[PDB]
């Protein structure tokens, strides 16, 4: 199939800025490439098709260009409603294929996360499972690193992370890391530490507790 390589996967911009989003086909597709906009929980909306042909109703700040293998989406003077995810699309041959997508987020000043660690509740421990939750509250940019240490033993493969959508008020993100152990494994160790690395912190911060 024809593979579309979209860049970048995320982008930071401000209202009134000009944005450029790139998409390259693994082989010639002529001008049969479009651009889609999508927001969480919403169906995609076609903004541009035919490389440069803007669909009816789409603001004129949207425009497409390029032909052959390289294609570009440009948005002049961003508007608050423009922050969303964009995909390129090609229908020159089958199967129809889509780019990786580009999440366009609101750019903001750096904001360090508030870090909290929650021990597993006694109620949950009666069931045989222990969940240790680490919270990174309202930080920016989105990139962060959370490391779990159990008695100074680096943990791996026993945690899951969840990131929220960019906040509509302060434009920050929040993140949760959950260390999952059984009641047996958990009761065999004392200190549970969550170390958070974020460029808003002068140095990584460690939140921990003694069981």
């Amino acid at each position: 199939e024809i593979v579309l390589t979209q860049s970048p996967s995320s982008l930071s911009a401000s209202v009134g800025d000009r944005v450029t989003i790139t998409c390259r086909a693994s082989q010639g597709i002529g001008d049969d490439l479009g651009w889609y906009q999508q927001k969480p929980g919403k169906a995609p909306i076609l903004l541009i098709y035919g490389t440069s042909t803007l669909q009816s109703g789409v603001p004129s700040r949207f425009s497409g260009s390029g032909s052959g293998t390289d294609f570009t989406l440009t948005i002049n003077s961003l508007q608050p409603e423009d922050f969303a995810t964009y995909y390129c699309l090609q229908d020159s041959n089958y199967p129809l294929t889509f780019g990786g997508g580009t999440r366009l987020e609101i750019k903001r000043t750096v904001a360090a996360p508030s870090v909290f660690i929650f021990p597993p509740s006694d109620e949950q421990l009666k069931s045989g499972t222990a969940s240790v939750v680490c919270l990174l509250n309202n930080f920016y940019p989105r990139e962060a690193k959370v490391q779990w240490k159990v008695d100074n033993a680096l943990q791996s493969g026993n945690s899951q992370e969840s990131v929220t959508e960019q906040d509509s008020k302060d434009s920050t993100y929040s993140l949760s890391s959950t260390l999952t152990l059984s009641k047996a494994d958990y009761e065999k160790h004392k200190v549970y530490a969550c170390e958070v690395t974020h460029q808003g912190l002068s140095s990584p911060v460690t939140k921990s507790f003694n069981r």
Binding site: E1, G34, Y36, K42, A43, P44, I45, L46, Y49, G50, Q55, S56, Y87, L89, D91, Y94, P95, L96, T97, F98, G99, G100, G101, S114, F116, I117, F118, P119, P120, S121, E123, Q124, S127, S131, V133, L135, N137, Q160, E161, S162, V163, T164, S174, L175, S176, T178, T180, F209
Partner: protein, 205 residues
């Protein structure tokens, strides 16, 4: 106005067959071809199948060829997608799209979840620690299927609340947390899980 309303999505066991339909209104349905496109969780759109206006030409994506069948009933303005031998990979929002030769017009889609999990209410556990701002929350663990809604103090508390997207656990059940920061009062999270008719209020101390 052009209207496309997908339906039929739901939880289906692996290997079973399911029939998705798409109700079209606002245009001459028998004059346009139609595509099926799906969106797996966290992934981009994936094209599925196409069908000509008269239903004589049908093309399928390799990942669904031999298992899915696309069809249409122009007398009912309804597009169909028959999914056989459903796999876990087939979990996604299935979209209905019209094409012309508005190049593509999409419906809101319908969700399909392939899983052996049985409907199960969530376990609600408190999140308490053990400095001005403090943090509390609730752990909504081991429920199926999506979704769950979490309020705080019956909706009287919304500022500072973060309800994280659920993650799919190895067990096939979903789990999420809801937290809120407060100035260092009573605090109670309200968990709602429609599929199991479960409604839980849990105070946090």
């Amino acid at each position: 106005e052009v209207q496309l309303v997908e339906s039929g999505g739901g939880v289906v066991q692996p290997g079973r067959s399911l029939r998705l339909s798409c109700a079209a209104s606002g245009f001459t349905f028998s004059s346009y071809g139609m595509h099926w496109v799906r969106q797996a969780p966290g992934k981009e759109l994936e094209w599925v199948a196409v069908i000509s206006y008269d239903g004589s030409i049908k093309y399928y994506a390799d990942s669904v060829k031999g298992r899915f069948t696309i069809s249409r009933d122009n007398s009912k303005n309804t597009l169909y997608l028959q999914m056989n031998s459903l796999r876990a990979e087939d979990t996604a929002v299935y979209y209905c799209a019209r094409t012309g030769e508005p190049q593509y017009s999409w419906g809101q889609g319908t969700t399909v979840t392939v899983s052996s999990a049985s409907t199960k209410g969530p376990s609600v556990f408190p999140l308490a620690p053990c400095e001005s701002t403090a943090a509390l929350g609730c752990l909504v663990k081991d429920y199926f299927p999506e979704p769950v809604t979490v309020s705080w103090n019956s909706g009287a508390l919304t500022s500072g609340v973060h309800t994280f997207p659920a993650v799919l656990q190895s067990s096939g059940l979903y789990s999420l947390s809801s937290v809120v920061t407060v100035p260092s009062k009573t605090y109670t999270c309200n968990v709602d899980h429609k599929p199991s008719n479960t409604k839980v209020d849990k105070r946090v101390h």
